[PDB]
Amino acid sequence: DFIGSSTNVIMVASTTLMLFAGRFGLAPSANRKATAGLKLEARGDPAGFTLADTLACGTVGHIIGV
Amino acid sequence: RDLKTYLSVAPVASTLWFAALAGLLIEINRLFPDALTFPF
Amino acid sequence: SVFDAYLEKSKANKELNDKKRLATSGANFARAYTVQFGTCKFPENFTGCQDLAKQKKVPFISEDLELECEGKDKFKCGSNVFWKW
Amino acid sequence: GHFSRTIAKGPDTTTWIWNLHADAHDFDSHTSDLEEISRKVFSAHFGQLSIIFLWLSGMYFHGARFSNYEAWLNDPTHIRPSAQVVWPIVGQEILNGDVGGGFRGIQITSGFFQIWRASGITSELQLYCTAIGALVFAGLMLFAGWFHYHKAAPKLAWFQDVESMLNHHLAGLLGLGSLSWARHQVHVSLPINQFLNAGVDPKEIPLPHEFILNRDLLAQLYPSFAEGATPFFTLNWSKYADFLTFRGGLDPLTGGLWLTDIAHHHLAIAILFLIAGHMYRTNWGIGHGIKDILEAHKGPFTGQGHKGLYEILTTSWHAQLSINLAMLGSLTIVVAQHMYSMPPYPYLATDYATQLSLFTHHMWIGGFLIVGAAAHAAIFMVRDYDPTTRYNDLLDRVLRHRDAIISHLNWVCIFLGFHSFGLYIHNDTMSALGRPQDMFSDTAIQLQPVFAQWIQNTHALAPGTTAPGATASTSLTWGGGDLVAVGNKVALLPIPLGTADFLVHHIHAFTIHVTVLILLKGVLFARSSRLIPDKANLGFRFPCDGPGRGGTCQVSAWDHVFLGLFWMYNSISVVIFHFSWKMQSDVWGSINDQGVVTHITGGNFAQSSITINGWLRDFLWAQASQVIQSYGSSLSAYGLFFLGAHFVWAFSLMFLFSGRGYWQELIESIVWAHNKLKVAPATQPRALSIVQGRAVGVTHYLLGGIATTWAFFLARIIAVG
Amino acid sequence: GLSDPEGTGGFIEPRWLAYGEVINGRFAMLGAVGAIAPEYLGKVGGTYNYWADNYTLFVLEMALMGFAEHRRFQDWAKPGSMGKGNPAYPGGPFFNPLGFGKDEKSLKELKLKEVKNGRLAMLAILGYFIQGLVTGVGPYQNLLDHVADPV
Amino acid sequence: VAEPDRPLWFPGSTPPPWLDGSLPGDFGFDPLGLGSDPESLRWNVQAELVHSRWAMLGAAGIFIPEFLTEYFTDTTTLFIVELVFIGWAEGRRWADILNPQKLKELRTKEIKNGRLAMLAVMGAWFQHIYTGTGPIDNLFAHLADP
Numbered sequence A: 001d002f003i004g005s006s007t008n009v010i011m012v013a014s015t016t017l018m019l020f021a022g023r024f025g026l027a028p029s030a031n032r033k034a035t036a037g038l039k040l041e042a043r044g045d046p047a048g049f050t051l052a053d054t055l056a057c058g059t060v061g062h063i064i065g066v
Numbered sequence B: 001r002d003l004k005t006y007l008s009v010a011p012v013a014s015t016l017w018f019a020a021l022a023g024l025l026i027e028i029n030r031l032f033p034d035a036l037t038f039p040f
Numbered sequence C: 001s002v003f004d005a006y007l008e009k010s011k012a013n014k015e016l017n018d019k020k021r022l023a024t025s026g027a028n029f030a031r032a033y034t035v036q037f038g039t040c041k042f043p044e045n046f047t048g049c050q051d052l053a054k055q056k057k058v059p060f061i062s063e064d065l066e067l068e069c070e071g072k073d074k075f076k077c078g079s080n081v082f083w084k085w
Numbered sequence D: 001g002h003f004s005r006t007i008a009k010g011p012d013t014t015t016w017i018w019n020l021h022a023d024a025h026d027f028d029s030h031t032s033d034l035e036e037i038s039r040k041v042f043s044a045h046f047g048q049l050s051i052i053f054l055w056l057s058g059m060y061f062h063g064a065r066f067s068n069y070e071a072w073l074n075d076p077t078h079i080r081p082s083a084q085v086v087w088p089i090v091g092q093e094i095l096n097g098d099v100g101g102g103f104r105g106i107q108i109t110s111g112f113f114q115i116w117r118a119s120g121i122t123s124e125l126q127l128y129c130t131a132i133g134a135l136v137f138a139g140l141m142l143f144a145g146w147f148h149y150h151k152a153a154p155k156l157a158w159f160q161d162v163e164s165m166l167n168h169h170l171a172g173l174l175g176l177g178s179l180s181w182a183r184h185q186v187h188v189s190l191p192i193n194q195f196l197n198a199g200v201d202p203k204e205i206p207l208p209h210e211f212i213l214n215r216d217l218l219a220q221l222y223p224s225f226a227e228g229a230t231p232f233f234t235l236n237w238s239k240y241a242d243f244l245t246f247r248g249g250l251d252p253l254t255g256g257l258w259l260t261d262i263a264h265h266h267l268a269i270a271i272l273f274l275i276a277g278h279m280y281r282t283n284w285g286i287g288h289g290i291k292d293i294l295e296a297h298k299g300p301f302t303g304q305g306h307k308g309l310y311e312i313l314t315t316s317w318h319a320q321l322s323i324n325l326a327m328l329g330s331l332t333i334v335v336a337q338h339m340y341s342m343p344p345y346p347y348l349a350t351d352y353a354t355q356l357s358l359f360t361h362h363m364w365i366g367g368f369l370i371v372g373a374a375a376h377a378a379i380f381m382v383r384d385y386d387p388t389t390r391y392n393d394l395l396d397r398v399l400r401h402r403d404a405i406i407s408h409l410n411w412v413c414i415f416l417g418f419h420s421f422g423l424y425i426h427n428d429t430m431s432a433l434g435r436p437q438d439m440f441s442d443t444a445i446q447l448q449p450v451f452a453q454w455i456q457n458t459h460a461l462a463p464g465t466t467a468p469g470a471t472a473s474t475s476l477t478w479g480g481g482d483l484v485a486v487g488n489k490v491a492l493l494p495i496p497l498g499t500a501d502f503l504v505h506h507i508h509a510f511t512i513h514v515t516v517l518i519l520l521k522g523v524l525f526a527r528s529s530r531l532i533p534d535k536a537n538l539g540f541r542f543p544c545d546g547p548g549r550g551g552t553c554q555v556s557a558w559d560h561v562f563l564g565l566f567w568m569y570n571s572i573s574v575v576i577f578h579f580s581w582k583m584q585s586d587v588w589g590s591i592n593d594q595g596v597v598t599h600i601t602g603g604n605f606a607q608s609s610i611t612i613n614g615w616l617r618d619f620l621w622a623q624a625s626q627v628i629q630s631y632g633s634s635l636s637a638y639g640l641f642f643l644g645a646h647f648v649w650a651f652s653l654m655f656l657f658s659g660r661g662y663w664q665e666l667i668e669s670i671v672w673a674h675n676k677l678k679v680a681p682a683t684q685p686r687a688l689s690i691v692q693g694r695a696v697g698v699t700h701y702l703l704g705g706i707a708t709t710w711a712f713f714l715a716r717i718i719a720v721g
Numbered sequence E: 001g002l003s004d005p006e007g008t009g010g011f012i013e014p015r016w017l018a019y020g021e022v023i024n025g026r027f028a029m030l031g032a033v034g035a036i037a038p039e040y041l042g043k044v045g046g047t048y049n050y051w052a053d054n055y056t057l058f059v060l061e062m063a064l065m066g067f068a069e070h071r072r073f074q075d076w077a078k079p080g081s082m083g084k085g086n087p088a089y090p091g092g093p094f095f096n097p098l099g100f101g102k103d104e105k106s107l108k109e110l111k112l113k114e115v116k117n118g119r120l121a122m123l124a125i126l127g128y129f130i131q132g133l134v135t136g137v138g139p140y141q142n143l144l145d146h147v148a149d150p151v
Numbered sequence F: 001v002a003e004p005d006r007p008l009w010f011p012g013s014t015p016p017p018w019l020d021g022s023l024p025g026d027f028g029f030d031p032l033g034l035g036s037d038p039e040s041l042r043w044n045v046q047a048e049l050v051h052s053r054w055a056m057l058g059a060a061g062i063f064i065p066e067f068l069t070e071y072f073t074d075t076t077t078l079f080i081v082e083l084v085f086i087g088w089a090e091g092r093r094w095a096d097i098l099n100p101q102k103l104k105e106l107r108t109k110e111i112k113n114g115r116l117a118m119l120a121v122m123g124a125w126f127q128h129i130y131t132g133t134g135p136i137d138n139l140f141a142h143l144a145d146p
């Protein structure tokens, strides 16, 4: 367990973090990638802290499989 | 309560009548099975 | 037929006379079960006769159970109701 | 007519009585109020669910008190699955036969026994509880319908929110439903069955709940369960692979799919339906407008397309009912062809009597529902199609080139019919004239199905190559050199495909295409035709429009369902026949000590199913001997029902080959005899309507025909298997 | 939109069912402290069995309670009851007079703090549940063990 | 003879239009309505009466086992004479069914006690069935312990 544990439990909480980056987008206020990433992408983004731990465990499951 | 009676007085009447008839016939057959004739 | 032996003594005297004091006609002026109230004089016993005791109490020792803040201050007791680690 | 006041009015003829039931569920003919209809059908579904729930309660109850399931559990190989017992009245007790386990009952084919073993059920106590729980649910469902029609009926707006309904049904019902069942498997089904396969005996198995509470009992086998923290939160997931696998194939001891695989299956299915559940738009932003997306698809060929669909499928039940019936029926068919090839239950494949009847039952249910899609699709055209308010454009064009689609489909059927049935008439003629070299056979001019043979070949070489994780094949019909033998019976085996298999598939291509033709012609030409420009004003269910134009009989869309109904019978009836003979001839049989396999009919399918005479002799005449010699035995009822079906069938031809004009005139003479003796009913006797006589005709035809095979099959496999 | 009603109503939408919410504000309260009372009165100095079978008490737990909790609705459904000394002139939401001795005292609201004491005692007593269930140990063991080894 | 005051079975409220307290013993009871037709009630009434009168006597059968803590030709004749006798008896009673303010009290009270025996006479047997034990002693014999 110990530190190692807290390092996987944080990367199964950072498996989350990488689909933050898709889409992260930024450009705040310029250019527009944020507003664009808040236009159609996202109707909030802890809905994507939540869309995170869902598909992220899948992305790891598939990146090992792909 | 007039209503329930009528309700029981439609084609259901037929089922109740035929159920009662069947029960009679079967029970008759229990007491007197394999009857090929009337011997009395 | 029906009076015969008090209806077999109310019948129900047959399967259960509830509790008839055992050690009968001895130290009886007490109670059913007999977690003995006993005679009257000396301790009642059926621990009971611990009674509050001192350290190294008996219950029925395997090693564990619970119990008390004896002597001068032992609670929370390490054995029971205490933080574990 | 209770439903309508004028309809209720009064009875003057007997026709009123027949009409009363005919339009009992015709909710859209009682009101024009969409909300009232929707409220009606929604409650009706509750009443349905209650009946099937009650149905389930009786299956579990009978399994508990009137079955030898426990007896079958210890010795599944040669104990006959039997539920329900017959009272000893007027000679009935003969139907109670030797089924093993010191029990007298009728052998069953529902397959509940195989289901119950898979669920890990061990005692009548457990079956007894499940029966009560079902009854309790039946009480709820019935009550729920009364509450949502008289107390609190939903608005039309409620039903129209299809997005919210979609998200739930394929996630709340499908996803969690699959997930919930996935849990029972690895906690109850898998542990208990693992014991059962070790010959531990049911009473010597610990109770299911002891497996859940303490990990100790469940952990000694499948040691991945040992870790309390579990490797799930470590997200390695490799450790779990002991209780679930991608092994596939078939367990050589129980003859069913590894529960080790089905648990993993549902685990995947669950979240796959949980993710796909998060698609459509609701209230908290994230999601899709199905209205929007549908609009987006358009084309050089379709012009505007799908625009307006959302309006149609949110205001017309018959439109939704047709789509659902078309695929729910199609789903039932693929269920039949997936459960035979991949036996998912313990000691299921071994039980030949159950498999034949399961495949055959699903084929009819699937076949009927698809025909029903034709009806409501046609009903939609007559009752709900309005271009002024709800134009689609997709629908247009289709109507625009409808004379094209039918004419082509007309041709394909003729091409198929010749190139299917004709080959058989060829073989029947060449063999009769004493020239088998000439026939379309494996021994002569052969027409090998190399395409199907090639797809099977790649399925065999799939594990390891294009399927690394797969240790074995998907189904053993794609195996290659594998052979599973549970008991002295063969569970499954690679199924060969020859010239005899080329012909029969082309017959199914045919029968399905013709069935499609009849039904599709009735839907497109439901409103207008060159013959009848205003058919839509005559309605969906009308007999005709007179002897004019040479004769316009059965121009209604109703009658197209009527004609296509016989063809759906003709169709399936030959699918199930293909299944029966092929499985008996080249799959089912007994395996010896040396490994030699003897099939029931002994591989006579390949060279005798290429002839018509061959089906009439080697199949019908041969395999009938059971049903026609079942008198004085436990299968006595099948012999009677075989004769009983042949009658209700020939009884239909009376209605189908004649018309009501004769009958009404006959009644006139009979009414006279009554009036002479003061015994004339005030409710004047009338003949059946022109359309009813067709409805009466096809029902009895299907009943007598279907029922007649039912007795055919069930007498055959029981006496032999 | 879970909140917005618009019903006749079969009671998922209109006003009650938050009415009940008000009153389980009280026996999740009496239930809680009344359940810790045997727990820590013994602090100083799983079937489990008491007297007969407690299903028999039940018949008398759902008996009197019946004769009791019944009427209570009666008032609601319609002001009077009238069967016995019994007076219940108070409003359906609350009937303080006659069963509260001498006091009469409601507006601060306290009621807002009594519903506040309410649904914290809900989650307090909802604590007790999942607490001693999925773990296998009571609410006070793991709690004491939780301030013991936080991380 | 109408009043909203009658001690209803379920307080606030219980008023079926058919029942009104005009009858004796009217505690306002009949959700089912098992008699909403006057032909329906007038018959039920007599029915609910004769029963009670009988049940009382049945009770008078529970009176005899405490006085002490079946025929000269068992059944058969004993019944036919009974059939033949109570027949004629009940016979005329049938023909009559189809062809002071003080008295109300008596009759209201008569029904209620009568109602008691039936519930009573009932109770003593569905406690006797499945459970072979007499009720003779049970009053303070079962009061020893639940």
Ligand code: CLA
Pocket (backbone or CB within 6 Å): D002, D039, D040, D041, D043, D044, D046, D047, D048, D142, D143, D144, D145, D146, D149
């Ligand atoms: C609790 C008792 C109860 C009572 C007194 C009523 C009374 C009424 N209902 Mg309600 N209903 C109930 C329960 C009840 N219902 C339940 C539990 C449901 C949910 C399924 C419904 C759903 C319902 C609908 C949708 C409608 C009514 C309507 C009506 C009114 C007309 C009756 C009628 O439809 O014609 C006929 C009476 C029948 C009893 C028809 C028989 C139907 C039953 C369910 C058949 C049982 C299935 C059977 C076992 C199938 C196997 C047969 C097999 C032997 C071959 C009438 C006031 C109608 C209305 O309001 O008028 C406009 C109406 O639209 N009811």
Ligand code: CLA
Pocket (backbone or CB within 6 Å): D021, D022, D023, D024, D025, D026, D027, D321, D325, D368, D369, D370, D371, D372, D373, D375, D379, D540, D541, D558, D561, D699, D703
């Ligand atoms: C998804 C299921 C489903 C639902 C909800 C409906 C609903 C409806 N249908 Mg549809 N139908 C379906 C499937 C369905 N159907 C399928 C699969 C087919 C193809 C066979 C049809 C063919 C069809 C036709 C031709 C018609 C309908 C019609 C109707 C409407 C009213 C008719 C009615 O009240 O029934 C009346 C019920 C009877 C007359 C009972 C008949 C007796 C049955 C058929 C005997 C069954 C034999 C039994 C199973 C075994 C023998 C038992 C016996 C020996 C005791 C109603 C909206 C009618 C309509 O006009 O639409 C508005 C219409 O004419 N349907």
Ligand code: CLA
Pocket (backbone or CB within 6 Å): D647, D650, D651, D652, D653, D654, D655, D657, D658, D666
């Ligand atoms: C097997 C099929 C069949 C059967 C059983 C019949 C039977 C009959 N035909 Mg018919 N007919 C048929 C085919 C059949 N036909 C065909 C293919 C055609 C060419 C289109 C005709 C053309 C035809 C004509 C032109 C006439 C008949 C007439 C008759 C009746 C003659 C009276 C009689 O002898 O006995 C009486 C009845 C029977 C022997 C059979 C009744 C069925 C059983 C015995 C009734 C018992 C029901 C039982 C309780 C089951 C209940 C079911 C349950 C769901 C309720 C009789 C009903 C004539 C007629 O109507 O005379 C009055 C007449 O005019 N037929």
Ligand code: CLA
Pocket (backbone or CB within 6 Å): E030, E031, E033, E034, E035, E037, E038, E039, E041, E042, E045
């Ligand atoms: C809110 C109302 C309420 C109240 C006032 C009580 C009160 C009580 N409960 Mg109940 N309880 C309630 C609600 C309530 N409960 C609810 C809602 C539930 C369902 C969850 C329960 C379930 C429950 C159980 C299972 C039990 C109780 C028990 C008790 C009693 C505690 C005795 C004990 O063993 O603990 C501690 C011991 C004491 C308090 C004794 C104190 C002795 C003092 C320190 C002096 C010692 C000297 C000694 C007696 C010598 C005599 C000298 C003399 C002069 C003093 C106490 C009377 C227990 C019981 O019934 O007792 C047999 C018990 O087992 N309750």
Ligand SMILES: CCCCCCCCCCCCCCCC(=O)OC[C@H](COP(=O)(O)OC[C@@H](O)CO)OC(=O)CCCCCCCCCCCCCCC
Pocket (backbone or CB within 6 Å): D297, D298, D299, D300, D301, D302, D303, D305, D306
């Ligand atoms: C020899 C072996 C090689 C195989 C090739 C030959 C076998 C396949 C038959 C060729 C059919 C061509 C399909 C073109 C692909 C195709 O369908 O294109 C679809 C095409 C696309 O239209 P759009 O681009 O507008 O579509 C988008 C919008 O229209 C919708 O929003 O629409 C049409 O073609 C309209 C006319 C219908 C065309 C009717 C022909 C139907 C063929 C009937 C046979 C069905 C066979 C199914 C078997 C499973």
